[PDB]
Symmetry: D2
């Protein structure tokens, strides 16, 4: 199996993209420490993924990535359970649209706290746990929105831009210690996307589908996490990516292009 | 004069880059509303700039860009004093280095609050004041660090990356209203840079100078705000830039290149 | 006048964008050496621009930018007539669409010869003429297409990408000699654009206009060279841009954004 | 095996990076059609790679990628031998440094002919062979130099910039046909690099090593194609990359970062 024996922490494992990474990594033979704040859903994901891979080694841990003391304790417990730490994937994040001239301070604080401080905390604690062994792999979740982003989405776009540059910067600082840090930019169907589609009128939905068909060269549709994103996540976590760091990996059928 | 009659708000006018913009704009004939939190220094700058341009129209206003109610009141007072608002330049910002694995929550909060929330608040209030007239000009201060940034500078780099993407995003949303939004990326001598140079040993200083000579193709030295940055700031504020929006303008002698 | 006394060579001065630069520079007080291969049209432009600025100093020269010996002779003659050379603007270029799988060798050769070799030749000869004085300004014409480009336009897009990187590279090599090199990315109405609009059915034209309205945040239309591009060209040629090099300047109402 | 049964054409298979791709793909179980102009060396590579993977299916073909009729005939012969065509990797390319003001027309022509026309020809013929099946994978070789590049290397840098944009452009045009197109940016030891190191004085070599140590965060040295590049090439050729197109993949230990 491509990730046989790898010791991986995945944050945001209770739903959507994060849950698809947990499933993908468990199926690839990794020992997976899934973390989230929704304990019932988080465990449910780990339990169902185990059913499909009998005998897997996995555990769920409660963790608020915005609270550094919590990250420190949870990450250290996971690394102890696994015997070490090879990869840390930070999928936890929050989404919220807003006209850019009407952003309440509380909204700004929440989005940056989870998307940016969460990245900083998880990356920092993972770095400290991996430094001693001279090798490590940190995978952050960026976004196509971090490049420019959509109408009524400047706030979220700004948070992901921060993650992109953070990733590029720490890659240079931690590379000499053997730690690689990259960012994934996925464009996949998620519960929130389905909810969005379900609340649109038939007219608005046909419009979105036609615009998405033109915007996504490969297939003209949002991807499927298990089918389109999982294989890339496995490559990134695997030893195959050991000579790449500070890069952005768009898994979006061509929606955007790095430059 | 290139900015004759222009009604401009400049934040961070009490020192460094911000003070150089106030001076440049006053010398270019603009009506300048300078704002900061250091009232004595802020007024001193406006007063000295007036001495060099007798009969100029200028005023200093106290404003905490991180506090939206304060921005709203101060910006509205300035626009009333001037009879309108043509340009808003957000220079206020904070710098602080830190190893990326040792960032205290309080440090993260302060840097994002001033550099990011400040940008959001000032941009939002300026937009609302300019929308009715169908034309407007917002100039944010980004940074070369926002691209990747330096060792022990991931936090600041992340904040400026947010400003860059914010700028690109709102440019698309507000363009249809006639408002252009761009970001300046300056590499100039500042009080903090001088302090840095002054605390280095003779060895470390010679090393920095040699590395800076290679890193800056044009002249091999940090620029002078009044000589190298002022002319670009005047162009950006002027009508000449009316067909450019969502761009980054590096005024750094070639240090970095946009792509 | 903003360009009073500046000694400027402009290639491609007989039509479109190039002719608008000649007009703009003559109106700004520059001494302009306009060059092209269409001698009748080239002189006509210079003659008409003179009528609007009586007493201007200007001359037309025949030059095939793809032929280095011709560039050397023509540029040296112009510099002798002017008493030196301060700025060289390379506007000459060719456009041609093609499905990317059906590009004839002759088509490839022509587009790269004019757009790329022409840039290399003009830049090289200008550099040699400016090096001795320790200061110089080279302005290349890039394109939004050089970033990614349009359907059936990969060939042209590739040529402009070459110009963009060429510009960034020589900026680093020639900066120590005092020469700055930048690229302009214009989105303006041109004879070829008008011809395109005129050959479309009413349906296809309405479609293009609606798509262009959404694609261009500021105004939703292709710009006007004399009104929207001229002011930026004057800034770039002027001393104001002396601390910027290796950059791309999109004058497109927001069509694309540098990153 | 990760590439079991894949039908792959690799150009430039006789030496360096290209030869490492042939070896990697043969070891991964692919059916490999290696092409070059150095027939003795090309066959030698295929023969040696076979020795290490007894029973592999592989063949060498003479092909000048700059000559479209030759590409058409050779590619069609290879596809017939293999029963189809799944992946086409264009590694063939030429390197040559030159001061940017002293580039002879013959030098310009050679570098663009091989690096750019070769890319166009190979991509076009591969596209036509893959279109009917509704799926295909084209992998071009770009370069870190294509971003900005080195001193005395503007010409090569320009050619690779063309490849990068070409890749991004055709990705959008051919995506609807099921064909993905990406570019790899490797920083590996090659015969030319070894030759460069061998001709430097002890002083110049120590200088290069120290500068390379700082420039490459992961390991501070040029990578090893078989160890550091092969795994990424296998991923790109494999089905795992099916949802990525128009991207650049830097396999350089962090030397540069996409944005």
């Amino acid at each position: 199996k491509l990730l046989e024996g790898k010791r991986i922490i995945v944050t945001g494992g209770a739903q959507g993209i994060g849950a698809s990474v947990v499933r993908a990594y468990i199926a690839a033979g990794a020992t997976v420490a899934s973390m989230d704040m929704n304990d019932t859903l988080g465990q449910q994901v780990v339990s169902e993924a185990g059913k499909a891979n009998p005998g897997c080694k996995s555990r769920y841990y409660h963790c608020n990535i915005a609270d550094r003391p919590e990250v420190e304790k949870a990450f250290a417990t996971a690394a102890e359970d696994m015997g070490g730490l090879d990869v840390m994937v930070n999928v936890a994040g929050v989404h919220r649209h807003s006209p850019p001239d009407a952003i309440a301070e509380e909204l700004y604080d929440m989005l940056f706290r989870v998307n940016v401080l969460g990245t900083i905390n998880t990356n920092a604690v993972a770095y400290r746990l991996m430094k001693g062994q001279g090798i490590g792999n940190i995978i952050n979740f960026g976004s196509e929105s971090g490049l420019t982003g959509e109408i009524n989405n400047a706030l979220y776009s700004a948070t992901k831009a921060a993650v992109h540059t953070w990733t590029r910067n720490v890659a240079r600082q931690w590379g000499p210690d053997g730690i690689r840090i990259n960012a994934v930019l996925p464009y996949m169907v998620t519960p929130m996307y389905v909810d969005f589609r379900n609340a649109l009128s038939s007219e608005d939905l046909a419009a979105h589908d036609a615009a998405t068909k033109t915007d996504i060269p490969l297939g003209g549709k949002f991807g499927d996490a298990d089918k389109d994103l999982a294989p890339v996540m496995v490559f990134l976590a695997s030893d195959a990516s050991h000579f790449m760091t500070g890069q952005m990996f768009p898994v979006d059928g061509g929606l955007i292009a790095v430059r």
